Design a protein around this ligand. Structure first.
Ligand SMILES: [Ca+2]
Ligand SMILES: [Ca+2]
Length: 72
């Protein structure tokens, strides 16, 4: 779209893998495996702390809306 929130929502489905509705470290590591670069679970855990604003253990679309600005 390009009008406002519509573009990041396509990326949330891109970041989510099993259609669970949240972005999780298990989902982040699959993207790193597709990328073919060094994989570090502790690095993925640091990404979870930036992504999980409410410390609920999951990255939700609202947590992601702030998160997508951090990663483009
Ligand atoms: Ca997910
Ligand atoms: Ca969360």
């Amino acid at each position: 779209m390009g009008k406002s929130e519509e573009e990041l929502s396509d990326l949330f489905r891109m970041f989510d893998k099993n259609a669970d509705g949240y972005i999780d470290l298990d989902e982040l590591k699959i993207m790193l495996q597709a990328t073919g670069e060094t994989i570090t679970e502790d690095d993925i855990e640091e990404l979870m702390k930036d992504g999980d604003k409410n410390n609920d253990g999951r990255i939700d679309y609202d947590e992601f809306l702030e998160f997508m600005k951090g990663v483009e």
